[model samples]
Target: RTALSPGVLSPTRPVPNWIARPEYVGKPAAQEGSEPWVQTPEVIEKMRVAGRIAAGALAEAGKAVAPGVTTDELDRIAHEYLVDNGAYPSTLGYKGFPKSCCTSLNEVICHGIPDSTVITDGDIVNIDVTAYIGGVHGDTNATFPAGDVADEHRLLVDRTREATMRAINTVKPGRALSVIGRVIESYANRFGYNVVRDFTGHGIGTTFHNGLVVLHYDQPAVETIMQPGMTFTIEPMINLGALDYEIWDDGWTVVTKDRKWTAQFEHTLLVTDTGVEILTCL
Candidate 1:
């Protein structure tokens, strides 16, 4: 499906930053929350399973991309894949979200729910998948070509994925959370792209999202030191145009301010004694 035009929200408008608040934001607790408990070993194992399922679903859905395939068909494939593996689609019914996966095309930044719209050639799309299995969650996403896309769109997708991988490699015990943002911003700036300021990565384990707020842009906050047990995601959303974004009336989809395309890639990781373990690797 072709991405809808960008929606405009006045800068003077009062919009709440729901992700920044401590209550909505997931934080590491002394003990596990109401969700089922997952020890370090079990967490890692389940994360692997969930990540594998997520990656596989994305791969399958990606193959279906063409001029005639509907976004709903992609959603159905992802939903069945997660269910067949005894896992749950994290985005399904999430805060009333109606899709199993988010299929954002072209200018849509994130949270574009699947629909009957048919994907057209020369469009860019981001498929975000999160899965829950064995009391742990796996989160990852990638923007891929819907067909033959513009050269700039291709570069944005490539660099965004590269930036995510580079940030993931930086994870280690005692490393500052600021390091993730630094590397992402550096790469994006070097390519003349803007790192998205609105949405950043977060801690994920038993709960779908929690703890450590990983911002993508420069901030004065001190680095959150990575502990051996710490687990989180390093997702950087890069914009081909200006970094600004606006929320659609649907209250979920976000689009670039200048109406330029955007791309994103994410991977969940755990800090290890030596380095990092990519939970979402296939």
Candidate 2:
């Protein structure tokens, strides 16, 4: 990929106050409660709507990918899609965040801001979409090839997405949350890749990154039981090199220290009495 400048940049989109927001919009995140851990019938229905809206916005943004497109254009497309569907771009203004969506290109692992970077052939990009509607939020993302993607990075892209779903497949009634990390880490290790430990999946609904944190490594940490009605995300960042990373000057974009490419996949899911429900499925 050539002509890619301003390697990492800041987001400039502004969300008007007129848009309806969730309860936690203005309050400090630390002051929020660790619930609606148990979603009621109404909240569950709202979540389904939010999830579909988010998934559609993500799909719409994916359509704009090409050699000449810019990440800022993708951000605008996704933001408008969310608005047309009657939802707020959840990533905007949350904790002073500026962007409506995240676009991570190449070595950028997560939280890449949409800026002047232009897409090109033989490169892959990750578009993260999260939407808030009816007092709940839905989150999901996927990696895509801009034009003719590099053969060397295709497996990294495919396996990273596979690791996300495989970890989700391990979700079960009363199962340990550590099972997610165990399964994801084992798969990444088998593929000779490293899982970034700096960012872990978190609970999302009304309050994004609120209740629970699901790790991606095989650490022997305290296990949180997966209960029905519980909602959270499983986003694994797999790197083609070591796990070490460095934050850019913007303080939002993060990239691999070795500058090797990375891939990620995420989805907000619900823990059902029988097993699980992928709330963010398209």
Candidate 3:
């Protein structure tokens, strides 16, 4: 229902290895790839493979959202599919993350741990999924309507999707990270929405998280240049109210400070000699 925040709980679950597990699992702190964010021909091909499975898993989960479905159920479905296809759930085990995917419902901005959150009509959910295959990571997510979602949420979700895509379109060689966020910021202001600044997008290719961070607001001043074969994510978290946020005691779930609904979209991309290649887009 509109404005009716659904309930979710994080239950301790062991990491399941229906397929193979990554070496970084169980480490309190994870490491980035020793190689640069730019990939070689060999690694580039591997990233493509990882991204394909990840996109596939994400699409599958998106199609499974319906009333009465729990977030954990969707997570299990995606986790099993990724394993059966021979890839590790990228979000699992690293830093003790206890899920195969992230489920953000309503005001929950990001890192909304999957749980028994049952969906109902007028509810919107954002499923963030990543897969680690061939030693690289691919990530993507989209806010979906659980049933007959409210017009207000539909507007937020649609605008967030547009902002995310436009931000992605801003990618190019020699372009500053500042430019990427500027586009999104302008678009958000157009709709009287706010872009959450505390958590920005990040570089992703051979690692779950990279040092090359991407902002979603203007005046980034980030000097990172796009290089051919460099891959990163452009996930923008847009809110219907203020941009301020609060972290729950669970230390993972981040929600809007005003308790307003938020929406986000994400996709991993690889920089080509000419432009960018969306690695995780279907």
Candidate 4:
């Protein structure tokens, strides 16, 4: 059976413990006592290539967003595009995940595994794409309207994208990582929307996922400060109702507590001497 149930409405059926949380799977340092270094010039170049490849894949997949396209068809197109560009989909088989790109519609927050689901008009779908190339990774996601969606759906997508861009613009050396959360919360609350608390953004580089958790709400837990040579993601999952979420039985998909619409946008970034560089920009 697919991880997602098409006929059920139970939110707690998927259970959280069944799914594996993202661990620090990055490579250890050469010396046991030393910390891992930042990306070198060559490594950054490779990341740039990977970023373009991912962006291109998203562009192709975005074009396929229509009334008749199935989620599986979109996944096949993305896989082909990634492979044709000499890159690999980072989510395929990663922790037993079955899709190349995540397709979360309506209440689905994130990690919606692609399947035979048909995307219809007035639905909002978040497409998360990640690519591995030359020992580096590039990750980005965007929520697009499947067709002529409702005003609420359009607001969710627009606000989520704006929040992402605003957070990225705030990135700079010597700034607190929590500042990103501050901006995200400020914007989201302005619209009376809630931000998903369970999932967060993270550091990305040589590994598919790395250290440095990027929270998307106004919280005091995260205290990591940004600096030159630092790289991470700031994809915030914003919801239209309560911030609570539950996992699907497939053990991967996340949905809002109120079953209202949600949207998300993401980008991998590097902190330069002056400002931030968005690696996934086309």
lDDT of 2: 0.84
- Sorting all predicted structures by lDDT, with the top scorer first, yields 2, 3, 4, 1
Clashes of each: 4, 0, 0, 3
lDDT string, candidate 4, 193-253, tens digits:
8887778887777777665678988877666778887778899998888878888788888
What ranges in model 3 sit over 4 Å off? 1-18, 33-35
Which pairs in model 3 have colliding backbones? none
Superior candidate under lDDT, 2 versus 4: 2
Q: Every model's Cα RMSD, please?
A: 7.8, 2.2, 2.1, 6.9
Q: Residue by residue across 205-224, what tens digits does model 1's lDDT show?
A: 87766645788777748646
Clash-forming residue pairs, model 1: 1-119, 26-210, 26-211, 27-211
Full ranking by TM-score: 3, 2, 4, 1
Q: Give lDDT: candidate 3, residue 8.
A: 62
Find the 10 residues in a row with the least total lDDT in model 4.
Answer: 7-16
TM-score of 3: 0.93
Clashes counted in candidate 3 amount to 0
lDDT comparison, 3 vs 4, better candidate: 3
Model 2 spans > 4 angstroms off: 1-18, 23-33
My TM-score estimates for the predictions, one after another, are 0.85, 0.93, 0.93, 0.87
C-alpha RMSD (angstroms) for model 2: 2.2
